[PDB]
């Protein structure tokens, strides 16, 4: 069980750790988060009390190094940093734990929610979508644009999601215009799965990452990517049975976790109505259709 210590908390801030969140007061003796489950990526996220604009945060994996948070009064944010000295780090953590100045990652034993949201999400894939190769962790915020959003403007601060565009030469084989536009199986199976992602696990990892950035940061480009990757599967007549069954589980947990009050901005009416009621896979997403009909019957 790993630890992300904080040097201090000089500004009042709501701190998120995965699906959990805690309010910290200005100069409250808060020194970090302990008992973080090994085996998953995690995200530690921030919303300042005095400017609720720019949700921002850090994707990390405690297996990849010793990470801590320190407030930078110049750039005005909580920064993740790596401590290269193991013994300094162990001694910092032990002291803060002994003084009980850390919140405990509040996982219920029964509760698979975070695993279910991050099953296919790998740090090495995150670091290719979010390019900052000198760090082992990845910064995301509310305002970062996607490579696709930037085509339609600082390339170094972009989310390099896989570009999906249903009216593109990539999506449509010369001579198969109607077939490929009305049945996206070519685009899903040959171009995206065999060609770019190599397997369904990488495709799902990116889909899950896009959703979590949408939810945790209100990142609009991430929301677009999540819906595009759902629509590409639902709009394909030919999808492996294991991928459909896995997609239904993925979406079920995403819809289960979404704050009820954000359904209006986080869910695209057209995409969900099409996916559940008109698409080739209208009858393949039993769990998802049932939770959407019971939780968000207005949208549908």
């Amino acid at each position: 069980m790993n630890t992300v210590p904080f040097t201090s908390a000089p500004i009042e801030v709501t701190i998120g750790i995965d699906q959990y969140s805690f309010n910290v007061k200005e100069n409250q003796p808060f020194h970090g988060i302990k008992d973080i489950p090994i085996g998953h990526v995690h995200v530690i996220h921030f919303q300042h009390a005095d400017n609720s604009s720019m949700r921002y945060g850090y994707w990390f994996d405690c297996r990849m190094g010793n990470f801590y948070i320190q407030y930078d009064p110049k750039d005005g944010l909580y920064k993740m940093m790596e401590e290269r000295d193991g013994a300094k780090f162990e001694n910092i953590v032990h002291n803060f734990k002994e003084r009980q100045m850390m919140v405990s990652y509040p996982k219920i034993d029964e509760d698979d929610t975070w695993y279910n949201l991050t099953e296919f999400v790998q740090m090495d894939k995150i670091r290719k979508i979010v390019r900052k190769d000198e760090n082992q962790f990845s910064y995301v915020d509310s305002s970062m644009t996607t490579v696709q959003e930037n085509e339609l403007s600082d390339p170094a601060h972009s989310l390099n999601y896989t570009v999906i565009n249903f009216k593109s030469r990539e999506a449509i084989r010369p001579g198969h215009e109607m077939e490929d536009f009305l049945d996206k199986s070519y685009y899903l199976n040959t171009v995206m799965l065999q060609g770019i992602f190599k397997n369904s696990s990488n495709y799902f990892g990116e889909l899950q990452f896009a959703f979590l950035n949408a939810m945790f940061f209100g990142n609009y480009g991430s929301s677009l990517q999540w819906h595009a990757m759902i629509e590409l599967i639902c709009s394909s007549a030919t999808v492996p049975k294991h991928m459909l069954d896995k997609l239904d589980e993925i979406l079920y947990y995403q819809i289960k976790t979404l704050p009820e009050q954000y359904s209006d901005i986080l869910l695209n009416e057209r995409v969900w109505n099409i996916c559940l009621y008109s698409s080739f896979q209208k009858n393949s997403l039993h769990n998802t259709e049932k939770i959407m009909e019971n939780k968000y019957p207005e949208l549908l």
């Binding site: 009216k167 449509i172 010369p174 215009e177 109607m178 536009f181």
Partner: protein, 237 residues
């Protein structure tokens, strides 16, 4: 974006553009079967592809054989239209290719956009204009070449005959839309108006009668009257 009353003069500028109307591509007669069910029988159709500035009409005749063994024909008809318009553009020398294609029906936008991905600089646009191009098959010579076709065929016409020798494109288009609107509202009455005087004929190389400037004013008046007479019925006003 969409072509409307506000940007109407744009049709007659020097940027090559085509209207595409797909309303006569898939045509059927509905009939009873021996068992008393209903079935359709396709008849020959056409794509109506028109340069509004020059009057050049690219009439692609859609022979019933293209529907043989196909499903969802009303959907397929839009994609076949887009395929043939795309083929027409690729067949034209670069300096003759349109800068814009305006579809008369919004359901043509995605099919045509997807077929024209190779031409990213050709704008595909809808229109808010309600254009009466469905009535093209009320022009006897266009109806005759479509119905007689035994195979896919493209036929080239000038839908303005020689009018551009005497009038501007704007005026020619206005005359064409009035004639087609009349033919669409009351075909019998419109054709009566066009041929009632046997001394005015249609040249072998023309679609419409050889009216003098004064005769066109009389005809145009008679077409407006026909359209208002008919409208006073439809709505009881």
């Amino acid at each position: 974006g969409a072509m409307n009353s506000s940007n109407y003069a744009e049709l007659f500028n020097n940027d090559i553009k085509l209207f595409v109307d797909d309303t006569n591509v898939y045509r059927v007669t509905v009939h009873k079967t021996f068992e008393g069910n209903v079935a359709t029988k396709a008849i020959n159709g056409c794509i109506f592809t028109l340069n509004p500035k020059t009057g050049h009409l690219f009439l692609k005749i859609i022979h019933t054989s293209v529907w043989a063994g196909q499903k969802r024909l009303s959907q397929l008809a839009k994609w076949k239209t887009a395929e043939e318009v795309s083929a027409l553009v690729r067949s034209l020398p670069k300096e003759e290719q349109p800068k814009q294609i305006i579809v008369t029906r919004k359901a043509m936008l995605d099919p045509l956009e997807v077929h024209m991905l190779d031409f990213p600089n050709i704008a595909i646009r809808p229109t808010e204009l309600r254009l009466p191009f469905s009535a093209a098959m009320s022009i006897d010579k266009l109806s005759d070449v479509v119905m007689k076709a035994t195979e896919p065929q493209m036929v080239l016409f000038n839908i303005y005959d020689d009018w551009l020798d005497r009038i501007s494109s704007y005026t020619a288009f206005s005359r064409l839309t009035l004639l087609l609107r009349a033919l669409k509202t009351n075909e019998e009455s419109a054709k009566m108006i066009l041929l009632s005087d046997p001394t005015i004929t249609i040249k072998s190389y023309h679609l419409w009668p050889s009216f003098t400037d004064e005769q066109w004013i009389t005809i145009e008046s008679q077409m407006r009257d026909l359209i208002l007479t008919e409208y006073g019925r439809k709505y009881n006003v």
